[PDB]
Amino acid sequence: TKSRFFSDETSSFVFAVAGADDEVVLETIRLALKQKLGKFLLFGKKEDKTLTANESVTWIQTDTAEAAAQGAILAVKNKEADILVKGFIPTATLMHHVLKKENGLRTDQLLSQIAIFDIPTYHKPLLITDCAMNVAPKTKEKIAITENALAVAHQIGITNPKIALLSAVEEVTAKMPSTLEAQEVVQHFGNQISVSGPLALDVAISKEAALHKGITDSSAGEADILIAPNIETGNALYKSLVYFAGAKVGSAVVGAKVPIVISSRNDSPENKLASFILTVRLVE
Amino acid sequence: MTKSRFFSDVAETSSFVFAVAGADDEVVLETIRLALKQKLGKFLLFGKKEDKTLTANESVTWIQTDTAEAAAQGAILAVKNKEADILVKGFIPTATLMHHVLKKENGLRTDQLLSQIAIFDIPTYHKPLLITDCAMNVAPKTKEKIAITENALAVAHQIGITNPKIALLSAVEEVTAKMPSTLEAQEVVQHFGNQISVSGPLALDVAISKEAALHKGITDSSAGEADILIAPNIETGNALYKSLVYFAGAKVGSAVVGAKVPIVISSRNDSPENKLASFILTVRLVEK
Ligand SMILES: NC(=[NH2+])NCCC[C@H](N)C(=O)O
Numbered sequence: 001t002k003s004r005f006f007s008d009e010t011s012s013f014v015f016a017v018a019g020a021d022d023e024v025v026l027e028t029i030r031l032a033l034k035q036k037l038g039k040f041l042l043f044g045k046k047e048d049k050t051l052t053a054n055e056s057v058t059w060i061q062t063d064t065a066e067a068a069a070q071g072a073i074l075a076v077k078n079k080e081a082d083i084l085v086k087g088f089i090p091t092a093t094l095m096h097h098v099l100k101k102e103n104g105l106r107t108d109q110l111l112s113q114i115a116i117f118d119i120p121t122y123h124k125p126l127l128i129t130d131c132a133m134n135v136a137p138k139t140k141e142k143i144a145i146t147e148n149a150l151a152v153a154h155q156i157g158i159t160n161p162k163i164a165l166l167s168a169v170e171e172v173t174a175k176m177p178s179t180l181e182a183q184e185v186v187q188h189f190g191n192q193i194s195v196s197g198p199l200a201l202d203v204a205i206s207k208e209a210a211l212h213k214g215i216t217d218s219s220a221g222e223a224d225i226l227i228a229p230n231i232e233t234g235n236a237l238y239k240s241l242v243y244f245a246g247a248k249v250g251s252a253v254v255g256a257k258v259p260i261v262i263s264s265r266n267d268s269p270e271n272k273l274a275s276f277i278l279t280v281r282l283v284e
Numbered sequence: 285m286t287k288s289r290f291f292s293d294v295a296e297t298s299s300f301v302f303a304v305a306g307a308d309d310e311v312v313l314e315t316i317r318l319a320l321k322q323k324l325g326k327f328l329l330f331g332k333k334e335d336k337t338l339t340a341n342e343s344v345t346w347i348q349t350d351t352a353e354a355a356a357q358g359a360i361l362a363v364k365n366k367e368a369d370i371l372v373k374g375f376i377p378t379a380t381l382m383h384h385v386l387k388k389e390n391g392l393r394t395d396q397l398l399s400q401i402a403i404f405d406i407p408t409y410h411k412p413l414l415i416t417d418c419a420m421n422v423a424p425k426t427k428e429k430i431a432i433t434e435n436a437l438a439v440a441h442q443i444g445i446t447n448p449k450i451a452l453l454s455a456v457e458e459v460t461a462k463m464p465s466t467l468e469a470q471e472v473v474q475h476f477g478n479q480i481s482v483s484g485p486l487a488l489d490v491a492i493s494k495e496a497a498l499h500k501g502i503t504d505s506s507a508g509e510a511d512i513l514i515a516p517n518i519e520t521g522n523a524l525y526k527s528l529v530y531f532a533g534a535k536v537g538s539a540v541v542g543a544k545v546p547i548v549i550s551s552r553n554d555s556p557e558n559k560l561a562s563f564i565l566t567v568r569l570v571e572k
């Protein structure tokens with residue numbers, strides 16, 4: 001038996017979809033509506049009548065990638081939408097406008113990507129950040145990445161998240177800069193939260209592995225959140241769990257005024273839906 | 285449906301000789317006991333505290349050594365003298381053994397870079413998967429990555445993978461100055477030309493899933509069938525290795541390659557099964 005984040009969830013929250021075109025985008029919206037997960041503002045070029053006939057869907061004709069992105073952003077800025085979803089446009093096209101402070105979405109806070117996994121071989125939900133956004137986050141960025149993850153954990157009901165700064169090794173050395181940054185982040189929080197690091201992955205998610213290395217702190221063997229040392233590590237972990245460990249995952253960009261869905265071209269419908277679910281739960 | 289597995293549950297056997305630098309403690313001894321029970325090979329045990337039950341095995345030779353230095357040097361000389369085929373790092377600091385090995389003058393290395401490599405039988409993948417470097421080279425750049433790729437090619441061929449499909453792993457497919465590992469991947473790819481099947485940068489999904497590659501608009505027959513992954517940095521290699529072991533249920537053996545003989549350097553936290561699978565890999569690496 002175990003605790004799963006994606007068990008058996010509804011709302012009137014509004015997703016603004018930037019580029020509501022192509023089935024790779026629409027399939028997820030169909031599933032969301034069938035479950036009554038939320039409502040949709042669809043900024044797109046070619047209307048799907050059988051979809052736009054749903055009472056909880058509104059279609060806005062938008063002929064270019066740019067107008068779709070700007071349409072969706074303005075909807076969030078005007079407070080008509082709770083959640084921003086990237087559709088059939090380059091991520092860059094959306095991000096450019098999201099990151100313009102004038103648009104009300106980006107504040108003082110670093111944005112970061114975060115994913116939550118139900119891994120059949122782990123005993124509870126596991127969060128991992130940052131797997132897709134921040135490329136080479138240093139100590140400063142990793143502190144903010146951790147703040148975001150903390151906010152996310154709290155919003156979703158994990159009251160005292162065990163946080164582990166991932167690296168390849170537990171010793172702090174000049175040879176491996178990610179170890180020092182881990183130590184400095186752990187130092188930043190002191191007693192404020194449950195943080196440990198640097199930790200190799202085994203020590204983070206396996207109490208037996210932890211004990212064998214003479215480590216008996218919480219985040220070791222019982223991590224709720226892994227802070228990736230770099231983006232290659234976060235991404236690889238993410239993909240590994242999905243493709244080899246059979247994990248269900250939902251992902252979002254957080255740190256902005258609303259959650260942002262930015263899904264991969266080859267994410268599964270179930271995982272794409274998972275991400276919508278995650279964003280609903282982030283807007284409470 | 286059909287999967288090709290590198291490791292067998294029929295005891296594989298040999299008369300190759302492991303020289304064990306520091307043959308003490310169960311963390312070291314247990315793997316040896318398992319290998320003997322399987323007739324995997326023969327052992328030279330350089331250690332301080334003799335297990336008389338273990339050393340009553342004809343395939344085992346005990347050499348009383350009181351210091352890690354003497355154990356490291358003894359094991360290394362056994363290799364130089366052609367008395368041993370494989371070097372095993374025992375209950376001594378790694379640096380005490382490596383410092384010696386890494387100095388070319390001692391006879392065990394060439395100018396070729398040394399690297400760690402691991403072979404995985406993953407329940408949800410259809411053939412053995414090699415990943416390097418998960419444990420040794422910390423922040424390899426282009427030149428090191430090239431050498432790491434050379435070592436993986438050599439390992440690949442020796443174990444019977446004649447045309448290895450190699451993926452340089454990164455977070456993205458698109459090359460950008462914002463992510464140096466993408467530039468580095470590209471350069472490694474350029475270095476090899478059409479001498480081998482090598483692609484990169486690729487995210488994991490494009491490397492080990494044909495569907496994902498396609499859905500990403502990548503249609504090369506090389507895609508989704510990687511035999512070897514080259515990690516962009518040690519945190520990535522290590523995290524991936526651990527992920528496969530602890531979440532994916534993979535069996536894995538690993539060795540340090542690039543030197544004149546294979547070296548076993550197992551983690552304190554490697555299971556006995558994976559430590560054994562490591563002995564087994566090294567036997568495969570010296571098989572004539
Ligand atoms: N070759 C190995 N035994 N690798 C597993 C150990 C991983 C790494 N050396 C660590 O300390 O976390």
Ligand SMILES: [Cl-]
Pocket residue numbers: 004118119120121
């Ligand atoms: Cl699960």
